[PDB]
């Protein structure tokens, strides 16, 4: 399947903006596999709020990380192996009642309980960057992530309510 | 090595407590076999204050969970490879800078972020059960854990201030 780059040259904004109607979504999880040698990044970032509700999946010393404020939880936490080795690694992030769930390889490697109540229209998903700047996250990091993306499923397509690229996507073919 | 039981009959308290001066700690870490085919329970906790100040780590569906509360960060949190298949694995809880870090079987599963500043004069470990009633846990579980100790390390020894038993401790020979 064709693969993108997940950074656009400085890596200082997403690749990829999707929009999607909260009410509508009957698909709570997204999917994808990734490949990289880059052991700091951002992998993907979402939220309902840029203040107050957003979550972010990355890499910190090849290691997942994920970082997420909201009403019930504020957290830092990294998990799982490194996946900074140039393989391509399949990637699950699920909601499963009040949590987050986080498979890797077809391993779940963590689950942060209690971190999500009732389910606040709308949520944004970028790819490979934030909507907010680096030094506003709970801890900072770079987060260009020079490695590649494919068979990505997010949220409920279905529910999907628009799509923006700042610049045209590029292959990694 | 000699390996004790982790849980003394009803596995409704814990089957030892030691004590510690904070001040006097310099190893900030603790280590240790365990071995059971038991999905939940206490494996140990420890507090400065029952209150606000606490931390756990056990096991929930076969997984590590560790459960926290203190002035900079609440939560509960799942990790790592199941733990309940009969076999002996080494576990180890550290203090790096402001987070708290989870090694099993010599790979890291687990890193708290920013859970912990300054470091309050005593912190208690208890093993095998909680200080304060399970339903006092930010998620209950059943504290009893049919399981075996053996090799444990905790923090300072040196540090040391006192060590408590409700009954005898039994042996897993
Ligand atoms: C709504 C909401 C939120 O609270 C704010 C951002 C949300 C996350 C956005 C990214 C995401 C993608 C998935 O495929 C599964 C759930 C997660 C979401 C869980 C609920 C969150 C974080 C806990
Ligand atoms: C002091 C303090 C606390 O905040 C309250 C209980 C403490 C924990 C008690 C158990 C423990 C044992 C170790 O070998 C490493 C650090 C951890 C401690 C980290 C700091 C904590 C939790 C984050
Ligand atoms: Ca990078
Ligand atoms: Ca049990
Ligand atoms: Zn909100
Ligand atoms: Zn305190």
Redesign the interface.
Known sequence: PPAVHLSNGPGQEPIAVMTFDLTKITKTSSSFEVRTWDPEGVIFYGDTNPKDDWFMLGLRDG?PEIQLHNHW?????????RLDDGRWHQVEVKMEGDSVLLEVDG????????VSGPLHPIMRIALGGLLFPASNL??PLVPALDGCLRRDSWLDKQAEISASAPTSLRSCD
Do not use: K
């Open positions: 290691r939880a504020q957290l830092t936490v990294g998990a799982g192996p391993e779940e490697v963590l689950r942060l309980r209690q709970r801890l």
